[PDB]
Amino acid sequence: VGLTTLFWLGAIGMLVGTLAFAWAGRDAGSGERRYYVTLVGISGIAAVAYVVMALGVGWVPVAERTVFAPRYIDWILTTPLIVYFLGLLAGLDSREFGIVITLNTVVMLAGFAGAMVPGIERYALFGMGAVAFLGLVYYLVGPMTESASQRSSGIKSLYVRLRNLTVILWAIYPFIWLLGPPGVALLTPTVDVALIVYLDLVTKVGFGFIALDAAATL
Template sequence: MIADAAVWAWLGFVAMVAGTAAPLWAWATEESATGESHAKYYLTLAGVTGVAALAYLAMALGVGVVSSPAGDVEIVRYVDWLVTTPLLLLYLGLLARPSRGVLAGLIGVDVVIIAAGIGASATAGTLSWALFGVGGVAYLALVYGLLVSLPRSAAAAGDRVRAVFGTLRNITVVLWTLYPVVWALAPTGLGLVTPATEMLVFVYLDVVSKIGFVVVAVAGADALTHLTAGGAAGEGSEPIAVGDADGAETEQPTVLADD
């Protein structure tokens, strides 16, 4: 027998709290051992699981449910995604260092996806599926950015940074693709699974896609040293031309300025 949705929400809360401890501990131990601080990287990771923990706490307590023509909508889940998914994209951007325009574009598309999901959950019938389709098209644009646009920038960051970025990017693309499938099967879509099963699957996906992301990022934190050392000379720079072996000029990608 599948447990009540609140039970899975409580388990999600506990898991996210544990996941938040990992980057905070890594940040504290790194700074005390080496004197270096990559605060913005670790705090971005902690923000992902920290916000998710608060969201699951609210869902476990039955807070954040909004009535709509299509039924009750757990709006707190979408608020969670509106905050945590841009943070995950931001961390990928901190590794790849694309232009601000590219990163802002990806986050903007991500917001469109979540907004379409809210609209689809709050409506019914043709309009609901039309909004679901809008979110699906936007998601294809996001996947293109993750698979094509960001790797172009990450290519200039060094082998170790590319390896960590590639793993995190793949986790994101594969697991995020499963969320709309669950939505379509859940009461929000075709109604083929119960609310308890929906919560169970979303908790599982969140644990793997968020805590898994955080664990891999912390395990690959040595890449941050290569990144900050290699990017210091080019902080905040615009594309610059450099000569190649044949004397031709090529452009280096714009990098985001470090704080």
């Protein structure tokens, strides 16, 4: 198994998700459509990013390592969509959406910049993102959860189900970044990539399938 192969698997998984979310969003009421559209964009962007990486593009040499730029472009665009999805589910008002979306962006921009910096100062960027991520988790389990408590029993359950999925799995990315090439480079690129592809598919497509499951029921 090689990087190219892992990237293709990522692209295929994202493509299957995209097609299923677009298809499932065939009917979609005049207000429940925004959810499906977010799911299609999320997995859609990731698919492209992966095909691009698969086609060997965006492999940027930094110091003595490689940085998959497409991966970060993907995250910078898709993570805010996920937050937006949870915000819609939790029923947030513009103000709260703003705070969570900016914290998210700080996390992603910081991780991207840190990866691109060859020197040791890069850990200072990683720290920024990590700190911003804590604030994000705070809003997900506190203020956003409280807000979701105002929605019906089932919507509240879906929100909690997706919230846990997101919080637990997102908390793992930083550890892989730190042990992978960007950090101490303990884990090899292939191992780093294999792990991240699994994580990307679950936090994106699995996340979408759990949502579809809930929708069907209700």
